[PDB]
Design a protein around this ligand. Sequence first.
Ligand SMILES: [Cl-]
Lengths: 46, 46, 46, 46, 46
Amino acid sequence: MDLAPQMLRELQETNAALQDVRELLRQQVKEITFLKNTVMECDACG
Amino acid sequence: MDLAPQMLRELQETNAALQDVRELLRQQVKEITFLKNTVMECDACG
Amino acid sequence: MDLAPQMLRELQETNAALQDVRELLRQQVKEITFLKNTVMECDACG
Amino acid sequence: MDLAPQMLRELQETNAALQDVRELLRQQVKEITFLKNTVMECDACG
Amino acid sequence: MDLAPQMLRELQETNAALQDVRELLRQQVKEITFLKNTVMECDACG
Ligand SMILES: [Cl-]
């Protein structure tokens, strides 16, 4: 009653924030996999 | 009257995102664990 | 249909998902700390 | 019902926390990228 | 009369959980940054 539109707005914000977190992690996972491969192929390692 | 339908939609969307986040983190820890093991076996380190 | 109960269900699913996220992060921190300590003892390093 | 005010307060805290998380992840992606770029120009690797 | 008390409970638990995740992420950034420098001063890199 009356603040319901306020609650919905906060829900949309959380949703947007999660979208970001998600693109951030997909970017992170790709960099981490890059690191992995590279150390995996490091001469000095044997 | 109420915005239940809209709030539920946002909620469903949040959950879908979270499910992808949990899957991304699961994969990330795996890669990190693979990286860890590699380094431990890295000849130049000891 | 009255949507209250469905909303409550999504929230509980959010919580479950977040409890998984916390445990993943928790394990993740432990692996990266281990990796760090490992690199600190990498003889080819400094 | 009479719990709405407090529900909004919890929803707002969630968003504030989420923004912190987003901010920390963005910096994080930055540090991992620097790490990556360092492995690349690391004479003893590839 | 409603499901609010139960809804409030879930919301409160989401927040408690996010608190841990941001705390965990804060600790992780710190480890990573340290790893970053350590690698930055690794003799074997050139
Ligand atoms: Cl992370």
